[PDB]
């Protein structure tokens, strides 16, 4: 699904079809992130229902996200080169 077909489905305007073609019908993934530090380094456990972000001692302010796996791999390598991307869920001007 080349970049040019992406440009065409932008030319038509079907944003939902694109959000589909680049998610469900390929590689969806889920990541639990913190809200103070802003990194994908949350230690989570589900059938016990408990979370922990040891970099800030935070067991309350955590949010889950739906991203492709390739973005997870990308950001893990960028962190592996000491360049940190931080993701926040609310604007602040």
Partner 1 sequence: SQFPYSSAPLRSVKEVQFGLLSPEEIRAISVVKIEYPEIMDESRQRPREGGLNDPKLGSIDRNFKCQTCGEGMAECPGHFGHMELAKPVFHIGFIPKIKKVCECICMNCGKLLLDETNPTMAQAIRIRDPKKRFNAVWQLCKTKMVCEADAPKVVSRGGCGNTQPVVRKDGMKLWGTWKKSRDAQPERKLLTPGEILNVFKHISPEDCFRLGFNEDYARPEWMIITVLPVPPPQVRPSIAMDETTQGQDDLTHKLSDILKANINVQKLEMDGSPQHIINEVEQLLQFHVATYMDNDIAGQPQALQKSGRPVKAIRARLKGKEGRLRGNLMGKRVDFSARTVISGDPNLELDQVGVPISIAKTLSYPETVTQYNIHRLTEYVRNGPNEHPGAKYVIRDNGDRIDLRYHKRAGDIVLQYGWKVERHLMDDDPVLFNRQPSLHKMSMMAHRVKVMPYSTFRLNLSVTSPYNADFDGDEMNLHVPQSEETRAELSQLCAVPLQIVSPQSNKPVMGIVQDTLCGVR
Partner 2 sequence: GVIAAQSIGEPATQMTLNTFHYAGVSSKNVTLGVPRLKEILNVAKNIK
Partner 3 sequence: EETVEILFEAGAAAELDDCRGVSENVMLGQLAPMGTGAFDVMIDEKLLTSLPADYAPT
Q: What is the binding site for partner 1 (CB under 8 A)?
A: 1-6, 8-9, 11-14, 16-17, 20-22, 24-28, 30-32, 38-41, 43-46, 49, 51, 54-55, 62-68, 70-74, 76-77, 79-92
Q: Give yes or no for residue 55 binding Zn ion (CB under 5 A).
A: yes
Give residues with Cβ within 8 angstroms of 66, minimum separation 6: 23, 28, 29, 30
> Looking at beta carbons only, is 3 or 90 nearer to partner 2?
3
Residues 67 and 60 sit within 8 Å (Cβ to Cβ): no
Quick one: which of 29, 22, 25 has its CA closest to 5?
Answer: 22
Among 11, 25, 80, 83, binds partner 2 (CB under 8 A): 11
């Amino acid at each position: 699904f080349g970049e040019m077909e992406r440009d065409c489905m932008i030319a038509h305007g079907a944003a939902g079809f694109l959000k589909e073609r680049l998610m469900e019908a390929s590689d969806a993934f889920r990541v639990h992130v913190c809200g103070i530090c802003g990194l994908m380094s949350v230690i989570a456990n589900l059938k016990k229902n408990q979370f922990e972000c040891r970099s800030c001692k935070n067991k309350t302010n955590i949010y889950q996200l739906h991203i492709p796996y390739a973005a997870k791999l990308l950001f893990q390598e960028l962190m592996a080169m000491n360049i940190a991307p931080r993701l926040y869920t609310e604007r602040s001007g």
